[PDB]
Amino acid sequence: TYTLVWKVWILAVTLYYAIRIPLTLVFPSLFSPLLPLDILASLALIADIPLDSRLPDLLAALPLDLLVFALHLPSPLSLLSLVRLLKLISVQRSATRILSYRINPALLRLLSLVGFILLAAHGIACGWMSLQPPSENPAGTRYLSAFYWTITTLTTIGYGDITPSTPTQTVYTIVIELLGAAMYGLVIGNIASLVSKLDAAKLLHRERVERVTAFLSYKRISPELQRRIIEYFDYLWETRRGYEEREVLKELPHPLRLAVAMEIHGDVIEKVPLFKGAGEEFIRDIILHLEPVIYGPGEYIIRAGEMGSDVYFINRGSVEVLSADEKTRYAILSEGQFFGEMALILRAPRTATVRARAFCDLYRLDKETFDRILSRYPEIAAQIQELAVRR
Amino acid sequence: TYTLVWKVWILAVTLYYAIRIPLTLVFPSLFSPLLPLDILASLALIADIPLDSRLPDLLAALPLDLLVFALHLPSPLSLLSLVRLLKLISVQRSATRILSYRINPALLRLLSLVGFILLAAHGIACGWMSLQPPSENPAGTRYLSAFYWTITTLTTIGYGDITPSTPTQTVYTIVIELLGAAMYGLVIGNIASLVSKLDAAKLLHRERVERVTAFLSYKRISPELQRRIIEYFDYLWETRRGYEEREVLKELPHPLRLAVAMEIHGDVIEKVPLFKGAGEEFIRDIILHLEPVIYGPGEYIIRAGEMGSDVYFINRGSVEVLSADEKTRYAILSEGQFFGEMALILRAPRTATVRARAFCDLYRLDKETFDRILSRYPEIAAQIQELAVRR
Amino acid sequence: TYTLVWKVWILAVTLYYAIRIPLTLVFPSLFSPLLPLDILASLALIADIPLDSRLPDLLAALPLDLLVFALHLPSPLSLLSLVRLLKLISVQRSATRILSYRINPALLRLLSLVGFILLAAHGIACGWMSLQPPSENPAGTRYLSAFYWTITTLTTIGYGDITPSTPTQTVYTIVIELLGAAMYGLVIGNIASLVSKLDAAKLLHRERVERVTAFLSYKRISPELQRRIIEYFDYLWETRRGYEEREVLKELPHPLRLAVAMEIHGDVIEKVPLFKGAGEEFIRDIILHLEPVIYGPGEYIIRAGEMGSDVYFINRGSVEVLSADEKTRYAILSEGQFFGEMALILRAPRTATVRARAFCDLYRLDKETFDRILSRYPEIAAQIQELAVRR
Amino acid sequence: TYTLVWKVWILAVTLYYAIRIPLTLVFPSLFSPLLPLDILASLALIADIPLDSRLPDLLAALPLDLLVFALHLPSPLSLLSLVRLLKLISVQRSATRILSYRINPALLRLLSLVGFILLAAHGIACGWMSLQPPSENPAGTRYLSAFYWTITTLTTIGYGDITPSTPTQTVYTIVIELLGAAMYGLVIGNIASLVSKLDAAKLLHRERVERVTAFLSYKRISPELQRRIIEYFDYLWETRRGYEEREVLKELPHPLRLAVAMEIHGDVIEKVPLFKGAGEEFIRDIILHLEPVIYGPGEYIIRAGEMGSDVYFINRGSVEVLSADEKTRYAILSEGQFFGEMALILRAPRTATVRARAFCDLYRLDKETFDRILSRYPEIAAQIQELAVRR
Numbered sequence A, B, C, D: 001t002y003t004l005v006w007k008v009w010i011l012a013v014t015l016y017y018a019i020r021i022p023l024t025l026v027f028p029s030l031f032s033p034l035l036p037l038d039i040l041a042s043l044a045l046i047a048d049i050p051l052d053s054r055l056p057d058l059l060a061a062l063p064l065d066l067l068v069f070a071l072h073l074p075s076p077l078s079l080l081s082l083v084r085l086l087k088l089i090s091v092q093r094s095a096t097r098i099l100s101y102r103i104n105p106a107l108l109r110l111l112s113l114v115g116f117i118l119l120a121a122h123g124i125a126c127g128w129m130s131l132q133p134p135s136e137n138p139a140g141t142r143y144l145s146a147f148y149w150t151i152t153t154l155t156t157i158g159y160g161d162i163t164p165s166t167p168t169q170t171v172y173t174i175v176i177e178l179l180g181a182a183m184y185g186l187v188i189g190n191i192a193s194l195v196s197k198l199d200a201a202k203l204l205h206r207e208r209v210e211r212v213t214a215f216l217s218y219k220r221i222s223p224e225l226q227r228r229i230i231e232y233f234d235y236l237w238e239t240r241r242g243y244e245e246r247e248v249l250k251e252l253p254h255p256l257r258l259a260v261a262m263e264i265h266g267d268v269i270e271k272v273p274l275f276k277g278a279g280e281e282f283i284r285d286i287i288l289h290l291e292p293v294i295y296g297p298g299e300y301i302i303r304a305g306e307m308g309s310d311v312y313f314i315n316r317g318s319v320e321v322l323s324a325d326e327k328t329r330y331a332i333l334s335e336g337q338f339f340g341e342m343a344l345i346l347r348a349p350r351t352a353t354v355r356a357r358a359f360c361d362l363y364r365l366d367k368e369t370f371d372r373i374l375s376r377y378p379e380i381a382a383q384i385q386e387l388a389v390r391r
Ligand SMILES: Nc1ncnc2c1ncn2[C@@H]1O[C@@H]2COP(=O)(O)O[C@H]2[C@H]1O
Pocket: A302, A308, A321, A330, A331, A338, A339, A340, A341, A342, A343, A349, A350, A351, A352, A353, A354, A391
């Protein structure tokens, strides 16, 4: 909406204060020419406290740096201007909460970690500048040298060209080596873990298929069977992106699970002429008991002569029904067609054999659900009965 | 109690000896002015051995450093004063055991790791001081330089300004680089892992909701359904802090599980006028079979015309009961009210539809428990029967 | 087939361009003598775009470096020749997809990571060469010094002998320390994890046996029982390489599970004279319900006087059947033999005791499957009946 | 046995060759005075090839270094003496296989990793010595400087005092920084993981109790209930060391599971006068269905008036049986006693209430097992019947 433009501009003015307060604390020559662009961001902070633990909010909303820089206080009390950086925690939380609705959150956390370490490095460089003795050197060169030393120490590379001389600089260097190096290492570890977490679904698919292929290679499986299995896993990845629905649907509660199920399987519902145009109630019952199954090319979906429980609804593919000895081709079933009603409209062993002419996605309704649905709503069975006899 | 003041003072006097023994081993000018504040801590160690593997206890309780420093022994036997630092392991174990009753233990382990690495750095700096040639330099500056070198080596930064000169210093430096650097890296890794472990419950909530949202975004779920789901996960986090009770209650044994269950669900027990004032026995039976369920705003808790098993007790929220065609508003049920008895006092399909006027927390008693409770204790059913007919 | 020779030659010409473009960008003295061996690889790129997100493909297929090097453009536009390295991502994906059919993929990923970091180091060294002031030095020595500096910075070792002097070199060094060091650390972590993942099956066996042995050592198990258990785990590892079939077979769908099961247990099927030569249908039913079990030497497979459910088919080993008091040796059963039919052809308690004369692998058919198979196909029972009475 | 003295002496002579071959390759002044102690270890290698992939065995068994050092070959062919270090892999595998029978294996792997990195550091130092220009310096000082440089580079500390000068030394330094630093980091990571794995049982106990305590603290559990739960977890840790038997027993097969179960629960079997002296068969049936349960002090094991299924056998503790209103103390049951037979010898609701006077360990036989055992073997019931009536 327009809250996001406000939260982005709060982010912009707090990055402004993070970049500006240490620079002015180092060089007091500023705060004179940057004042016109200042003041307005302080009003922004003081006006963002109504426009929303809020303890950092009320502490950072205080116009404290204005008076500190105006009165030219010495360092013990000049270091108090940095109370305007406590807005960083609140703005980080707000950005994480708001911007996660559209973009991958792991990426957003990675960006937040990068920004935090960069800001900390800039602040440490500014702190290192002050402890240096006063020398007639350009400000740009001085800041470049300080930032170079800060990145060298924080990355645990330590070339050794810039080293502390005074005991004050030595204590500061010790503190930096103890804290900033460890924090940087921890943030790098979190960034590495977050990089790994970017594609957890693809990693789960890869680890499953890798375990299966390792077993198959150990068991001296024939190459004909190595294919038909690796290709099946590849098709699984392609079409379904390794998200097994059963596992992820379980987390949601039943009211929302229903909505998710109808939105997902609405494609199958609309196509099957038996499902579509039927009452909403039947479809609600059906939508949770439809089980996707994947059959490879030239694979036997149903054989002639098993007890026969399940009924299969074709979603995307084509199958063929053959005789008990695979000599009469009967009829070719296709997308939107369904087979398996005779076994249960009557009570006989499987009538014929069903083979897949190609890669096919089939929805399988279980025996228990079929018996319940044929009992509770007969209108549905009526369509089946004309279909069963004709068949 | 007062054991904690004793265990804290043992910690204080053992940190005193960890900080003091190397300093006196380096500078023998001490142990003359720090003796009055000494001696009493040695009595403390010798009096703590009755006041409690205890092998470090009995070895560190020995007044060994007194005689070593009094006789001015040379280094081969002067290094034996450090047997008073074996109390560190025992005091660390005791602190971990005792202070975990009130504070997060992960934080306590983090503090212990920080203290151990700091103490090791101080000791290594003191050891590095002795190997240096005798120079007319201030003790403070010498210790600062040694500590600076120790932190530089241990952090694998290696500026290079302070380097070994004698072969003895070279061997010491090699040993430090081999051991202290690796130990520091391992302790930093443990500290990082412990920082991550500080909020495992919030990480579990985040990983669950992230997986669900990734699935939903992949499946092209409509924004109307993206909300109602993200908000539900947010309410779940808010109210219940992502602790699913079923998972955590399982670990406890049944005797203690009962006490936990009554203390948790006592709020529901006291409110429901049917539950409260009833015999303790009924409530004990009920307290384990009450299943919390969360229904979103404007959601259908019960529909008119399913077989109807469960009975729902309202804990915090409001629901409405409507006609089969949602045209008569009947009665508005509220906090402390319960619905669903007619389906099972009689044996009919669901009488009416129940919708949620707002976000509601409902306790659901299963069909099996309801039948058992209505059989074993009839007094409870009596209240239901007047309620069922009136309804 | 011959696609692999093409994909390998695409890999060869893209490693050629990764190694060549920065070298020519540094030294413009090239591209004159390497032109004859060039041009043909550019035709290879332009001819590989029909011979197959493909956005890197179409961008890298453009003959952009030819015109850049021919017109002698200055650096702002000379840096555009590096658009021929976007083929690296596509060739990496293609190599990972194609070469995984024959070699362990973890090893292939390790090789890819090593190649990527080596190529990045070469590129960074070439970039560092350009920023140096023009000096009358040999090209080989200059490149060696630059590569030495690049490996020093990227490995976070930082000797300090080669350091930036100009502010341009300082900014480049800062960027390298920030990016390349972190990327190198992350790639090293991935390589370590991949090294660990090379033998996940052997790690799972080791962790299972380690947990069991820890429990046994805690419970003060006698050494006679420590052996018979560690040896059994060792035999398990030897023969079956710690791949429990039940766990890995579950992942595959039923059509492919059948093929895997027959190819695996075909050894048992062919040997048993009862199984072999029987109809394909019986064998299909049987092949999924045959449960491998491992019995140690001198171990009681069946005792005389339990109800008796299961029937065991000997696969590799020898067992002995003794009297109820272990005094008559009856008959010695061997490889390919089976026992346990009397208990269920009749309905009696176990007739005799079966002990293992040596380490034996037995296939156990469950009670439920045996009753079903004896009902559905009688021909099989006929062979059993002559066998049962004679026994 | 005596194989271990042989495998230890193979380890000793292969560490001898790992330490000696590079030293002689650097200084050719050796191999003259160390020859008497040599030769015998070469016979040891040539005699260990009968006394046992074995490819490293047959390659390292070849007396190759003798001829290389005797003929004074130049470096290209002098580097071939290092084929006697391929025995390291085979000896490492043999040590890991053999010494794991008595000591924690994680510790053994830690020692192996430490030895491997130390040996690699020594070898790299020896290699760095040769590339140096010939200088009139003591061998001890030269080796100390080389080892100092090797540890500095491998630990990524890089002081900078010892740096390559010739391009040959620069290439060697680059290779060392690329390989040895990464290998050292990976070995340090493995050592850290192994240190963590040393006490996995205590970590599992700690993580379980920590999760439970976090839940309890969140739910505002009263301090009376915080105790009785933390103390129960502490007693669990004390007595059973957090090894839940059910989880670890599952891994073992049934033949070995029986032996483990009888050796563990033999204490309970011998004590109960009903169990002990009974036939081995009954005890075999019982030994798997005895379920340990832990009841806290002053806790209600059985209440008067539930249906009553289970029978409890006291193992270590004391319980009291009271009236329905806790006014008559009846009899005090103790260690070795059992209660709960009346509920099932007759068919009545629980006769009286059983409370624990102290912390008690109870074995609980389930209802199904009790009915089966009372049917199959009546002799056992006979003892129960006199006991039931008297009670
Ligand atoms: N003549 C036919 N034409 C089209 N479909 C058929 C015919 N005979 C059988 N089928 C279908 O093929 C299925 C295979 O056997 P079922 O008993 O499962 O149910 C069968 C019917 O759905």
